């Protein structure tokens, strides 16, 4: 029976740490509003990438 070496596979982070945040996630967004304002200053929608 013959054997062949396993294929190389390098794993690491992404270019400019892509994907580690939650930009453009309507379900999971953020707010920069005042303690007594209740107006989300971060309109984190999926229109812009």
């Amino acid at each position: 029976q013959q054997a062949m070496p396993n294929r190389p596979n390098y794993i690491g982070f992404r270019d400019n740490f892509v994907g580690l945040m939650y930009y453009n996630s309507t379900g999971n967004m953020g707010v920069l509003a005042g303690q007594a304002s209740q107006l989300n200053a971060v309109v984190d929608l999926q229109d812009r990438n």
């Binding site: 920069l32 509003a33 005042g34 304002s37 107006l39 200053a41």
Partner: protein, 100 residues
């Protein structure tokens, strides 16, 4: 408020009006009404002297406006010449102010 913006298309339409009403087909190649008019006052019959004055005025305006900026652009409205205006332009979009 009499002097009103005129689009080049309207001017060409008026130019065609003048041409047709005067008995020249607009499609017999090129033809401009301004070409059939004298230049100097002493080169024109008294009647069309108003037209001569208009033509001299038009040439003066045309060369004044740089159309071949006049003084409407170079002194202040020119970004290259005006440092303050250029610097203000550079920050046109990077503005931000919330304080609730």
């Amino acid at each position: 408020g009499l002097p009103d913006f005129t689009s080049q298309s309207m001017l060409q339409n008026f130019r065609n009006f003048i041409l047709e009403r005067s008995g020249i087909l607009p499609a017999t190649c090129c033809a401009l009404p301004s070409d059939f008019v004298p230049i100097k006052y002493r080169e024109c019959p008294p009647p069309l002297w108003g037209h001569c004055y208009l033509l001299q005025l038009a040439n003066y305006l045309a060369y004044h406006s740089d159309i071949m900026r006049c003084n409407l652009c170079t002194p202040h409205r020119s970004l290259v010449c005006n440092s303050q205006l250029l610097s203000e332009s550079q920050i046109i979009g990077t503005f931000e102010l919330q304080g609730p």
